[PDB]
Coordinates of C-alpha atoms and ligand atoms in Angstrom, one line a residue:
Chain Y
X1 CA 97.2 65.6 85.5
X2 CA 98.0 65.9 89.7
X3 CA 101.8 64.9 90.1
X4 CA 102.4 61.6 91.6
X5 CA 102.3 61.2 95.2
X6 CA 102.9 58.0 96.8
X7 CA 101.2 57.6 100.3
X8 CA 103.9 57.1 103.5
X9 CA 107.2 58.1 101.4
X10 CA 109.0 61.1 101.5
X11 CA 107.6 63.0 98.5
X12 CA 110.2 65.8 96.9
X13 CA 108.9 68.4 94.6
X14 CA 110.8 71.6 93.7
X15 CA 107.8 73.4 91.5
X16 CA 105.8 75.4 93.1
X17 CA 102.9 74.3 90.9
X18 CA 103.4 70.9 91.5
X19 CA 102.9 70.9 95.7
X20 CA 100.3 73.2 94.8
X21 CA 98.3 70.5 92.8
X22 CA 99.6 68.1 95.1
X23 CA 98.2 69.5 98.2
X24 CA 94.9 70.8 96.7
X25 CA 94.4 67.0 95.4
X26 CA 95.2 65.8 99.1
X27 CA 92.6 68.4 100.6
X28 CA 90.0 66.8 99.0
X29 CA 91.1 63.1 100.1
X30 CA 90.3 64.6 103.4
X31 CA 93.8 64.9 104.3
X32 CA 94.4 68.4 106.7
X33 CA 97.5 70.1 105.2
X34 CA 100.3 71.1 107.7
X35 CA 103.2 73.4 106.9
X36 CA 106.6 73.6 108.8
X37 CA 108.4 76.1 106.6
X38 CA 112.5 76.2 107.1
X39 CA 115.1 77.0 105.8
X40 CA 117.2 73.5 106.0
X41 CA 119.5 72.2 107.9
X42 CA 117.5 70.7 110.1
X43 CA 118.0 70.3 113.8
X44 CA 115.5 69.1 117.0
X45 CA 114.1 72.5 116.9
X46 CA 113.1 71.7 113.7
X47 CA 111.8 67.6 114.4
X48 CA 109.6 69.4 117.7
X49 CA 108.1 71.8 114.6
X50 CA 107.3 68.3 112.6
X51 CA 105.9 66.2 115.4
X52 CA 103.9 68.5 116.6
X53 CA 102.2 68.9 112.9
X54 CA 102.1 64.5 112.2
X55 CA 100.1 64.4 115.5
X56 CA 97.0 66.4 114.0
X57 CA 94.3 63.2 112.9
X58 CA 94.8 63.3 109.5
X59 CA 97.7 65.2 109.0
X60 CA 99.6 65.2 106.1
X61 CA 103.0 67.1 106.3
X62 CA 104.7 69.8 104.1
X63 CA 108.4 70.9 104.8
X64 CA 109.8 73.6 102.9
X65 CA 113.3 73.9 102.3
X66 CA 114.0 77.5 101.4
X67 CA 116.6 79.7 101.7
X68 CA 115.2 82.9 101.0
X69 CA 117.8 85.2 100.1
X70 CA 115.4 88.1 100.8
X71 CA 115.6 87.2 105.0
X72 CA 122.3 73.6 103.9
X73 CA 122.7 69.9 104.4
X74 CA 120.3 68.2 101.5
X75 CA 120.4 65.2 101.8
X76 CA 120.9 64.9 105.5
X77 CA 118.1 67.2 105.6
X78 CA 115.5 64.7 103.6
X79 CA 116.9 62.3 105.7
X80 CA 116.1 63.0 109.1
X81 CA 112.3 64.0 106.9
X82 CA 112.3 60.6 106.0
X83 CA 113.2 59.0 109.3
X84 CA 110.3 61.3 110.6
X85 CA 107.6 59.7 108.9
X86 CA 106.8 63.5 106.4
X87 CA 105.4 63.0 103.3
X88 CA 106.1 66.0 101.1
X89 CA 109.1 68.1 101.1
X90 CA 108.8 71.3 99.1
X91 CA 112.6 72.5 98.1
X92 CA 112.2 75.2 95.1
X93 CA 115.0 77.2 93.7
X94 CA 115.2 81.2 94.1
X95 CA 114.4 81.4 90.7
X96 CA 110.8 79.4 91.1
X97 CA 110.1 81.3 93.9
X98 CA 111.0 84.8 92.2
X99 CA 110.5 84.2 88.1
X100 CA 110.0 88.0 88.1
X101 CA 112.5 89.0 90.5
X102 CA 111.6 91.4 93.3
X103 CA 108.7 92.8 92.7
X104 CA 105.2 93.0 94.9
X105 CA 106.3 92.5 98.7
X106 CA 104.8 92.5 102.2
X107 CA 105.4 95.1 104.3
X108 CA 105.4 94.4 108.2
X109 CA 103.8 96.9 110.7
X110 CA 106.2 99.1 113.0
X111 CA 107.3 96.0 114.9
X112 CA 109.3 94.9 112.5
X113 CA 111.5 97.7 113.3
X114 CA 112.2 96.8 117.0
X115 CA 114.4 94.2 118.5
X116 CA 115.7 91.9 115.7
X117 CA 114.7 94.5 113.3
X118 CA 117.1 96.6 114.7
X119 CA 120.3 95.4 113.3
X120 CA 117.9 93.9 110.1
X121 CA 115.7 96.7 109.0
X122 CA 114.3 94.4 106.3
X123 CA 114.7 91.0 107.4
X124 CA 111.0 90.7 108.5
X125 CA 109.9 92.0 105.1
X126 CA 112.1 89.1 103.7
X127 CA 110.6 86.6 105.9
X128 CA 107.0 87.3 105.6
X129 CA 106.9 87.7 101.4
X130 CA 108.3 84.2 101.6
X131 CA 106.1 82.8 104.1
X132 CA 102.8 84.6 102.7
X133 CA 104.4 82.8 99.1
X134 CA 104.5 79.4 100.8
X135 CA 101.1 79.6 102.4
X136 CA 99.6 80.7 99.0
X137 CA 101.7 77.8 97.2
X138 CA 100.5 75.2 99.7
X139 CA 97.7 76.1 101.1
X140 CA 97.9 74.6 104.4
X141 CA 95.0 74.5 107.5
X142 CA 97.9 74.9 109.9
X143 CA 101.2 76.8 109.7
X144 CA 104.1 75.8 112.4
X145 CA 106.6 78.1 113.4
X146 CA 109.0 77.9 116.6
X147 CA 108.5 80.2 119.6
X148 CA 112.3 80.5 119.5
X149 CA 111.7 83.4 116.9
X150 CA 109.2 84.8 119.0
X151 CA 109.4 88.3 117.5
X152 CA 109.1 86.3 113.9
X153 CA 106.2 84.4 115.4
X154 CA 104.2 87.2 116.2
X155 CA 104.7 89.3 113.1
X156 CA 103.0 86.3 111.3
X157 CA 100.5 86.2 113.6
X158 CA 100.0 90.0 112.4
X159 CA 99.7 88.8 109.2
X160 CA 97.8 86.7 108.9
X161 CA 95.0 88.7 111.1
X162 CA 96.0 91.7 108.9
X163 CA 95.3 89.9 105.0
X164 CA 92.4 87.8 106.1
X165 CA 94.7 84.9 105.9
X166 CA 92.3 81.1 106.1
X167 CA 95.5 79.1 107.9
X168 CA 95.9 78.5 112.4
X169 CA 99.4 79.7 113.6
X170 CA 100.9 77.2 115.5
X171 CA 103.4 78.2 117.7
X172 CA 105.7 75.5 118.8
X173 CA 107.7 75.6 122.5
X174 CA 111.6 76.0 121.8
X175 CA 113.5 72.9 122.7
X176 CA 116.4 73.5 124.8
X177 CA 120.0 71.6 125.2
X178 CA 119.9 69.4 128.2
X179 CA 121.8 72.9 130.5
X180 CA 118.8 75.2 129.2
X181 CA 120.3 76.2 126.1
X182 CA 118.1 77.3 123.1
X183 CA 118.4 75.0 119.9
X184 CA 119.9 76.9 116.8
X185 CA 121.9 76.0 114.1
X186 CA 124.4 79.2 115.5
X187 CA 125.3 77.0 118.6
X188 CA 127.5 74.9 116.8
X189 CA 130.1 78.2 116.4
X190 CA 130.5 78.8 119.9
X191 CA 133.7 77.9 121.1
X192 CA 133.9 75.7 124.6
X193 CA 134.4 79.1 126.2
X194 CA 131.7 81.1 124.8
X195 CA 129.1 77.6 124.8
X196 CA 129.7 77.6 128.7
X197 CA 129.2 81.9 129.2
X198 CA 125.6 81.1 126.6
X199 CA 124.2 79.2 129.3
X200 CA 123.5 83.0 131.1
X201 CA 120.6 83.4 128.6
X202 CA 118.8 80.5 129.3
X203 CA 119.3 81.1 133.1
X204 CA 118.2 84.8 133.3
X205 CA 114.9 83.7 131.8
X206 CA 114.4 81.1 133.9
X207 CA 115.0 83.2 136.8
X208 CA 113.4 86.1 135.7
X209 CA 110.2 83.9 134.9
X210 CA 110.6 82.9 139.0
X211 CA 111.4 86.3 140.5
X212 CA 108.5 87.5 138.3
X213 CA 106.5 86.7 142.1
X214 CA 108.5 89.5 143.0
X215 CA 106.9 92.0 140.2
X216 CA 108.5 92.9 137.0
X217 CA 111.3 94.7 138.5
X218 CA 112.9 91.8 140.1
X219 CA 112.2 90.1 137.4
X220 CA 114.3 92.2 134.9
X221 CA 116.8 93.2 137.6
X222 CA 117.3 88.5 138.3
X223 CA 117.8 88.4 134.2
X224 CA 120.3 91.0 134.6
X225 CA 122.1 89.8 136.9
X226 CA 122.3 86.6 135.5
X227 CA 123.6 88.1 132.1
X228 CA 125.9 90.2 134.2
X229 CA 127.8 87.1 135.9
X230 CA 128.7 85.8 132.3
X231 CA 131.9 86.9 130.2
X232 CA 131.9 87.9 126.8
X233 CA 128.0 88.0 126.6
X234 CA 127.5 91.6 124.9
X235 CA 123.5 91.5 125.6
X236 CA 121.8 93.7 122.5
X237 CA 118.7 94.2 124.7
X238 CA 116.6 92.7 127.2
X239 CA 112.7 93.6 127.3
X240 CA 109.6 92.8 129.3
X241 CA 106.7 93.6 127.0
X242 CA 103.1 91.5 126.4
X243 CA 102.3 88.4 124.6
X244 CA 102.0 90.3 121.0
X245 CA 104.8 92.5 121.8
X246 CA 103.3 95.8 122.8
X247 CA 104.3 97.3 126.2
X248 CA 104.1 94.7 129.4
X249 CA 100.5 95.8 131.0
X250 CA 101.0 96.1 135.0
X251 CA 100.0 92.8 135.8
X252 CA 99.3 89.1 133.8
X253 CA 101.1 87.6 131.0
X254 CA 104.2 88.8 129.2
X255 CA 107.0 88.0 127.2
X256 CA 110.7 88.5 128.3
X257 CA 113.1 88.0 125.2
X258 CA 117.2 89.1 125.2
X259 CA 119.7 88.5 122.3
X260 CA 123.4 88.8 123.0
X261 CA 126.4 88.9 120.6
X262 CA 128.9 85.8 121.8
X263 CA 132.3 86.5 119.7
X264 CA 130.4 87.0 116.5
X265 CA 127.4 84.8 116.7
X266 CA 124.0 86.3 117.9
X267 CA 121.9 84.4 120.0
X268 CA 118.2 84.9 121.2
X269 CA 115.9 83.6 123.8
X270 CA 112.6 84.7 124.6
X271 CA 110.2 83.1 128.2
X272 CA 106.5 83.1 129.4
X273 CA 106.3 85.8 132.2
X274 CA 103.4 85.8 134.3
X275 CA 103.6 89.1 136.6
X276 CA 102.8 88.4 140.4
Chain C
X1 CA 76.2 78.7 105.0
X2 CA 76.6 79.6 108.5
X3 CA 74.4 82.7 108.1
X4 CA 71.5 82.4 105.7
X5 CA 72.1 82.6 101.9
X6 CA 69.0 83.0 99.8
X7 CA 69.8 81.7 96.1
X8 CA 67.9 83.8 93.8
X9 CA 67.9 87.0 95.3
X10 CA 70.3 89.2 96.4
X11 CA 72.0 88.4 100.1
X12 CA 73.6 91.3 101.8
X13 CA 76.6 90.5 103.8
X14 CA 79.3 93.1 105.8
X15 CA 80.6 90.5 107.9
X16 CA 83.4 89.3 106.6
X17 CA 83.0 86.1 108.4
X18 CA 79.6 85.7 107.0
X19 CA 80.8 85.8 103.4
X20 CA 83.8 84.4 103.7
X21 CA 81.8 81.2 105.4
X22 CA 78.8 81.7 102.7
X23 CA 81.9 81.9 100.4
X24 CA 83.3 78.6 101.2
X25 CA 80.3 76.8 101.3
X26 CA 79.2 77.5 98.1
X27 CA 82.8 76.7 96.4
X28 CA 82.4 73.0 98.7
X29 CA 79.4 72.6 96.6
X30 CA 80.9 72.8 93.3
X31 CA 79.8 76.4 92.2
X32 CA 82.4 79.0 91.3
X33 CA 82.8 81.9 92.9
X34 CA 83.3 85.1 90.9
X35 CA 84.5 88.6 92.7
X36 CA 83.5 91.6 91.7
X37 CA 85.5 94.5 94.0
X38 CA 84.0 98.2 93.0
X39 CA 84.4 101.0 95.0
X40 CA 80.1 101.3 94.4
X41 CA 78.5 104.4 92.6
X42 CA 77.8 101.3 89.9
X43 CA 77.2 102.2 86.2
X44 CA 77.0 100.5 83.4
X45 CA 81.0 99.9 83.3
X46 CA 80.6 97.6 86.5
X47 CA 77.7 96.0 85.0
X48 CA 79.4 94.7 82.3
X49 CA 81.7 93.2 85.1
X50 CA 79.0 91.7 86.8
X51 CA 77.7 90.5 83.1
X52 CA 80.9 89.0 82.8
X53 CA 81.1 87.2 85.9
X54 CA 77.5 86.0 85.9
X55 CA 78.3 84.2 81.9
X56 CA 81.1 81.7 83.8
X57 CA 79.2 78.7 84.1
X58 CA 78.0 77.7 87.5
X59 CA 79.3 80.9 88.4
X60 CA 78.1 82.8 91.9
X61 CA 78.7 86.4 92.0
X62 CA 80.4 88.4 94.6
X63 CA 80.6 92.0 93.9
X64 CA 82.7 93.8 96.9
X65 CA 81.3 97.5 97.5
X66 CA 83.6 99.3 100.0
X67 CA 85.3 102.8 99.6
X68 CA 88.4 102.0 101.1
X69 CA 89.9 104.5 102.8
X70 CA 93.8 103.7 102.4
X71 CA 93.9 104.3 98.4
X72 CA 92.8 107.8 99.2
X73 CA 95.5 110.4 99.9
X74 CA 94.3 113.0 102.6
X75 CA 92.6 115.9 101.2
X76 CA 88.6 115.3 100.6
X77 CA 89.0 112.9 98.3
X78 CA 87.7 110.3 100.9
X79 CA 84.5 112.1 101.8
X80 CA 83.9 113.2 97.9
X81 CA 83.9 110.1 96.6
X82 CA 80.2 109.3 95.3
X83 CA 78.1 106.9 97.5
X84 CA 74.9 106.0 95.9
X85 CA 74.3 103.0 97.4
X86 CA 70.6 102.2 97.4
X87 CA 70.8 102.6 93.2
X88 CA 74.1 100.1 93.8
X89 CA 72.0 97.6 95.7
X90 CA 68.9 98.4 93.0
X91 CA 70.9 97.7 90.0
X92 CA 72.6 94.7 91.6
X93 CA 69.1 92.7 92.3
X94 CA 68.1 93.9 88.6
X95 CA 71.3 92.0 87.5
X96 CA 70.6 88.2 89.4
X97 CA 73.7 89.3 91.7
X98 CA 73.0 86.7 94.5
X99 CA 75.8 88.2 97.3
X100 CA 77.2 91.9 97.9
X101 CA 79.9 91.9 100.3
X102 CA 79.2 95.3 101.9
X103 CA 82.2 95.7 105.0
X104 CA 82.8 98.8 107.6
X105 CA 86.0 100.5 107.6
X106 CA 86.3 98.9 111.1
X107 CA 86.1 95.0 110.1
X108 CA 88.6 95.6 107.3
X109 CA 90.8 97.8 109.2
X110 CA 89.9 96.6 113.1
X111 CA 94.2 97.2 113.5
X112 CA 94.3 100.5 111.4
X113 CA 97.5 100.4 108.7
X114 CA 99.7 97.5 110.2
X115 CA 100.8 94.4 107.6
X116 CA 100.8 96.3 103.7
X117 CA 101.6 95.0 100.3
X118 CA 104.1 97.4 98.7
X119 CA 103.9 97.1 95.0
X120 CA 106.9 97.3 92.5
X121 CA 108.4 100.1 91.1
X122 CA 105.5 100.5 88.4
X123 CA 103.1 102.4 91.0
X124 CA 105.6 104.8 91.7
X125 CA 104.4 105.8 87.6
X126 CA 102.1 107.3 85.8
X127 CA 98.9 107.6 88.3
X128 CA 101.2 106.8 90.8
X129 CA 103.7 109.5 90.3
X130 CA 102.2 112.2 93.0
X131 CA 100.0 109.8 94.6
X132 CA 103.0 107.7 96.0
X133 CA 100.5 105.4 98.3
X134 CA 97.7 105.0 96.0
X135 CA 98.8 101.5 94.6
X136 CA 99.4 99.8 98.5
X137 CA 95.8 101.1 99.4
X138 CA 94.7 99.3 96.4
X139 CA 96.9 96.4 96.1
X140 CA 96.2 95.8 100.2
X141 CA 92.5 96.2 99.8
X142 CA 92.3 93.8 96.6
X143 CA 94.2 91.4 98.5
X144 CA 92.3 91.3 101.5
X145 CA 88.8 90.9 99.8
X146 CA 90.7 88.0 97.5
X147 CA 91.5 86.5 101.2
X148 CA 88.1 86.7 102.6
X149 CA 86.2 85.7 99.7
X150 CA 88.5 83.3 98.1
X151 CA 87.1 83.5 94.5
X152 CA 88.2 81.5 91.5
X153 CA 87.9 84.0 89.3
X154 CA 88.2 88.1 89.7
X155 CA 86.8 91.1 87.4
X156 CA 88.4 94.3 86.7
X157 CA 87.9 96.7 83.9
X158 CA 90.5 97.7 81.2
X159 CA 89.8 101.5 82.0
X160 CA 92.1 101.3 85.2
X161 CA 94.9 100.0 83.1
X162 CA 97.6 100.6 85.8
X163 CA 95.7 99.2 88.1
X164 CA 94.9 96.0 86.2
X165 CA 98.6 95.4 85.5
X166 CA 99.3 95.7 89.3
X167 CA 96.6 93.4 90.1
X168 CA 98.1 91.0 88.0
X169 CA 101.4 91.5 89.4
X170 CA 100.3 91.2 93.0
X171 CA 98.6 87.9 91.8
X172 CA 101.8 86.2 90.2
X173 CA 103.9 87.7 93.0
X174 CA 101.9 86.6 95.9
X175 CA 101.0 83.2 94.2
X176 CA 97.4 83.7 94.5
X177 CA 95.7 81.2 93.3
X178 CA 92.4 83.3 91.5
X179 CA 92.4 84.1 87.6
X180 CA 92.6 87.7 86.6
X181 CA 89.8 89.0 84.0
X182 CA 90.3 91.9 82.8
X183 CA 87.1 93.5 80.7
X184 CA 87.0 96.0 78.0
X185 CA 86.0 99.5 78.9
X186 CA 82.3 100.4 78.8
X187 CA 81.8 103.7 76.6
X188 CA 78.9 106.3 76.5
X189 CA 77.9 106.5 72.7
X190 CA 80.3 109.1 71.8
X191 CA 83.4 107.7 72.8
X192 CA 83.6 108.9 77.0
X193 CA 84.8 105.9 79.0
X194 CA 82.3 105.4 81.9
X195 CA 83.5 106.3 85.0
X196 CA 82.0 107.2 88.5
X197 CA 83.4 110.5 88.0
X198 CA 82.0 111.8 84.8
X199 CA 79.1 112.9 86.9
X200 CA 81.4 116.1 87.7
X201 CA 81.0 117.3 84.4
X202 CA 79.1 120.1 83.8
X203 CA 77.6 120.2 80.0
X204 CA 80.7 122.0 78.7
X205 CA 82.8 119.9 80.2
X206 CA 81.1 116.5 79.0
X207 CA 81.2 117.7 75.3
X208 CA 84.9 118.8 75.8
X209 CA 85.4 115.5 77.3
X210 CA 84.7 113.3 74.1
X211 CA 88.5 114.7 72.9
X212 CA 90.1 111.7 75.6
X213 CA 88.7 109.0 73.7
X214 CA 88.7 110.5 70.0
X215 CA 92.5 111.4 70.6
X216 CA 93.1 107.6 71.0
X217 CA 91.2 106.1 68.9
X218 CA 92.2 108.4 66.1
X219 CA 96.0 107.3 67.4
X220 CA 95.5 103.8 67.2
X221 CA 94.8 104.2 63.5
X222 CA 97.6 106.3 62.8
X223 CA 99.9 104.3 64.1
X224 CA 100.2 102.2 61.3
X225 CA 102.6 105.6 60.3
X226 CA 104.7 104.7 63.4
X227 CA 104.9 105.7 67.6
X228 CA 105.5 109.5 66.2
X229 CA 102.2 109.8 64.3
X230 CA 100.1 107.9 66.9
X231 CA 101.4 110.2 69.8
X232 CA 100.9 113.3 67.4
X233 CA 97.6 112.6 66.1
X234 CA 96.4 112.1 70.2
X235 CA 98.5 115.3 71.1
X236 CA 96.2 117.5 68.4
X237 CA 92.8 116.0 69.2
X238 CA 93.8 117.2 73.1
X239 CA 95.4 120.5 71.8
X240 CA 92.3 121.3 69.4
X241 CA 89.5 120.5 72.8
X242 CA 88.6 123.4 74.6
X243 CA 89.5 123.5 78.4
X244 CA 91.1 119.7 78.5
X245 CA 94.0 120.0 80.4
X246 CA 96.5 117.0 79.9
X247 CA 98.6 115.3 82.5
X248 CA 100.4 112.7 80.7
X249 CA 99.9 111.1 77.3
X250 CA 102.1 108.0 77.0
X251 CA 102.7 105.1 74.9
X252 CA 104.0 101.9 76.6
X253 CA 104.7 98.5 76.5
X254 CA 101.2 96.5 77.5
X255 CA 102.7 95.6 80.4
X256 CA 103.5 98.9 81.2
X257 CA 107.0 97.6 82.6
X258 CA 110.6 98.1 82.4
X259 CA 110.5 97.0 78.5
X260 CA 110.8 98.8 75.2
X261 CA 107.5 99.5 73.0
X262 CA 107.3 96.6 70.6
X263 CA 104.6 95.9 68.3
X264 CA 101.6 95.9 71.2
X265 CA 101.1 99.5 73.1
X266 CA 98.7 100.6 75.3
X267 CA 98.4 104.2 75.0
X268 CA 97.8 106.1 78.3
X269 CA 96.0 109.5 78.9
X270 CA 95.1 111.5 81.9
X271 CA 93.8 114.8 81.3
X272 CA 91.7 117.5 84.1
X273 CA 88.7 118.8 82.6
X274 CA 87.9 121.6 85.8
X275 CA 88.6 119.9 88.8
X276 CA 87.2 116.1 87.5
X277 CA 90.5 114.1 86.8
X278 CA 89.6 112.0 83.5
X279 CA 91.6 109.0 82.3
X280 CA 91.2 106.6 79.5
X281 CA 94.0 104.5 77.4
X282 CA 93.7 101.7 74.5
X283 CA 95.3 99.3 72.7
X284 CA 97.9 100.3 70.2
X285 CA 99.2 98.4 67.1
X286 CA 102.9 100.1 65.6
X287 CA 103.1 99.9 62.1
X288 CA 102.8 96.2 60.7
X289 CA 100.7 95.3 63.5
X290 CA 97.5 97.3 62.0
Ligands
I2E301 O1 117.9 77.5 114.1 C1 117.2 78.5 114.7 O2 117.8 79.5 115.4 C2 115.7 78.7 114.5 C3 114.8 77.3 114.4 C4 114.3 76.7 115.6 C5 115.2 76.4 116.7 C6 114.8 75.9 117.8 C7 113.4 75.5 118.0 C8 112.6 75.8 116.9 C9 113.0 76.4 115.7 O3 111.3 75.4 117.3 C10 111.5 74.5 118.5 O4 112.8 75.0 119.0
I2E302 O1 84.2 104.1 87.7 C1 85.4 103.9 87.4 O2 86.1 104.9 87.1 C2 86.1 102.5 87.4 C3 85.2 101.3 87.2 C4 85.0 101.0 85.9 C5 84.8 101.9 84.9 C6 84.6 101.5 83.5 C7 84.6 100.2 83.2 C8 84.8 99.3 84.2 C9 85.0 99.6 85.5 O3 84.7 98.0 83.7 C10 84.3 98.2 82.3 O4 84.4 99.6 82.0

C-alpha cells in the first residue's frame, strides 16, 4: 500500500521507503519528479532552488531536509515550503539514512581535493554519498543545486556522467543581497564591520567579469585589487579556471571563484568569465 | 526502443545509450528486466544465471559481458583473462537471451578513473587482502551497468561469496532500488566449482583440484562436532592433495562481517594449484544446526 499523499499540501515523510513509493507512484500519474536537496534552514537561496523546480509543467517538488553529518529551523523551514506551494518534504533521521553506519561510499575524482577540499579533505565525499542516496531514494528527472557551490555543483555533475546516473543537473544562479552579496546562511555572523568589508567579494567578481575585455590578467589583477581595498578579508584563494574546473583555456568561458575567511566565518563566491 | 530490438533473438548492444533506451522501453511496457553482469568466457555456471533470470515471469534478460579493466591490478592479469566471445554470443542465443550488453573500455570509462565507490572495510579481507583495489573496480563496474540498465532484478553466483556480500552492501548502502539474487554454485560432477579459470589446469592439476570442494563438503558434515572439527576435517583433505597450495581457509559469519560465528557459516577457501588461483566456500551449520 503507497503512503498517502494529498495533492497541493505540503506532504512530510521521514522514511526513506515511504518518498520512495511516494514518488515512484507519482511517476506514473505523469507527474516529473524535481529534487532540491538541503540541508534546512532555509533562506532565498534556497526558494530560487524551489521556484526554479515548480516552474517545470508538471512538476511535482521534493525538498530534502538533511543534515548529513558526513559533509536547523523545522518548522520555519516547512513553513516557508508550505508558503511555496512544494508538495513533499523528505526530512529522514541519520539513522534512516545510515541503518548500517558507514559503510560503501563515493569517492570524488582529484577535484575534490582542490579549493574547498582543501581545508575539507572529505567533505565532498560526504556530500556526494548523500546526494547519490537521495537520488536513489527519490528518483527524481531533475536535481537542483545552487551555483553558489560551484565547486559542489560540478563534482555532481561528475557524478553523475561518471555512474551512468538517469537524472538533469540543474544549476541554479546564486541570489545576491540587494549590495552584491552572495546568499548563505553564514552572513548572518558577520558583524556590521566585517558585513560591510564582505561586500569586496562580490565586487571583485563583478569587476573581474568586466575587466575580463582586458584578458585574464586584468581580470585577476581588478579581483585583486578589489579584495585588496577591504579589511579583515583573509582571501583563501582566488582562481580563473574553465567551466568544469580544469585549467582556464586561453580564450572563451571560465569560472572565477575566491573564498575568504571574515573573523571566523568563510565565505565563497564564484562568476561567469568570458575571456576577451 | 530507439535502436531496433528484435524479440526472439538475441540483440547485440555496446552502446550504452542503446540499451539503456531498449532498457527503459521495455520496463515502460510492463516486462521485467533481469541483469546478468559476467566478465564473458560463459560456462555452465553463468548459465544457470541466465536460467535463473529467464524463470522470473515476464522476465527480459540482460547479461553484461565486459572485462573491466579497473578490478584488475597491473600485472597481465588484464590481457590473460579468457575472451571467448563468439562461444559467449553462441551459447547465449542457444539460451533465448534476447539482449547482451557488450560496451568498450572507452564508453564505460570515456573520463578514465574519476567518481569511485569505495567499499567498507570487508574488501580490504580475505580476496581483498593483497589486492587492495579489487572490490572498487568491481563494486564501480556493478554499479554503473545497474545505472545504465536499470534492472529489477540482478544475478550473481554464490561462488564469489565476497563479492556477493559486497554487492549486497553496495545495494543497501547506495539505496539501489534492484533485488539481489544470489545463485548456488554450478559444479563439475566431482565436486570442482565451475569457474572461467579451471581451464588452467593441466590433468594433474584438475584431479588435485577436486580436494577444494571435498574439503568443504566433508567440513560441513563435521561440523555437527563443532568450528574445530569442521576447520580440521577441511585442513586434512587440503593437506592430504598433492600440489594444492592454500591461501586462506576460514570460517565466518554468512555475512562475512564484523560479527561472531553463530549457528550459520560460510566456510571460505582459496588455494593455488600451479599458477591458477582456485576458490570455492559453502554453507556451514555448527553443531545443532545440522
Ligand atoms: O547557504 C549556503 O551557503 C548555500 C545555499 C545556497 C545559497 C545561495 C543560493 C543558493 C544556494 O542557490 C541560489 O543562491
Ligand atoms: O567464472 C567464475 O569464476 C565466476 C562466474 C561464476 C562461476 C560459477 C557459478 C556462477 C558464476 O554462478 C553459478 O556458479
Amino acid at each position: 500500500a503507497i503512503p498517502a499523499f494529498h495533492p497541493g499540501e505540503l506532504n512530510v515523510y521521514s522514511a526513506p521507503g515511504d518518498v520512495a513509493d511516494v514518488s515512484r507512484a507519482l511517476r506514473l500519474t505523469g507527474r516529473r519528479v524535481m529534487l532540491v536537496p538541503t540541508m534546512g534552514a532555509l533562506h532565498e537561496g534556497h526558494l530560487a532552488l524551489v521556484r526554479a523546480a515548480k516552474r517545470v509543467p508538471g512538476s511535482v517538488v521534493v525538498v530534502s531536509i538533511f543534515v548529513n553529518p558526513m559533509q536547523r529551523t523545522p518548522d520555519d523551514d516547512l513553513a516557508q515550503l508550505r508558503a511555496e506551494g512544494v508538495e513533499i518534504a523528505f526530512t529522514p533521521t541519520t539513522a534512516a539514512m545510515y541503518p548500517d553506519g558507514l559503510r560503501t561510499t563515493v569517492q570524488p575524482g582529484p577535484l575534490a581535493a582542490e579549493l574547498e577540499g582543501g581545508p575539507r579533505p572529505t567533505h565532498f565525499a560526504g556530500v556526494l554519498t548523500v546526494v547519490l542516496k537521495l537520488l536513489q531514494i527519490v528518483r527524481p528527472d531533475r536535481v537542483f543545486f545552487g551555483e553558489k557551490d560551484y565547486q559542489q555543483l560540478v563534482l555532481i555533475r561528475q557524478l553523475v556522467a561518471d555512474f551512468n546516473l538517469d537524472v538533469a543537473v540543474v544549476g541554479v544562479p546564486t541570489v545576491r543581497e540587494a549590495d552584491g552579496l552572495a546568499m548563505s546562511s553564514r552572513n548572518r555572523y558577520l558583524d556590521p564591520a566585517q558585513r560591510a568589508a564582505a561586500v569586496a567579494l562580490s565586487a571583485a567578481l563583478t569587476a573581474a567579469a568586466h575587466a575580463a575585455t582586458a584578458g585574464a590578467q586584468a581580470a585577476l589583477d581588478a579581483a585583486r585589487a578589489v579584495l585588496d581595498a577591504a579589511p579583515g578579508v583573509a582571501v583563501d584563494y582566488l582562481e580563473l579556471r574553465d567551466i568544469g574546473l580544469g585549467p582556464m583555456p586561453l580564450n572563451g568561458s571560465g569560472r572565477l571563484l575566491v573564498a575568504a575567511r571574515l573573523g571566523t566565518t568563510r565565505l565563497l563566491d564564484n562568476i561567469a568569465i568570458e575571456i576577451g
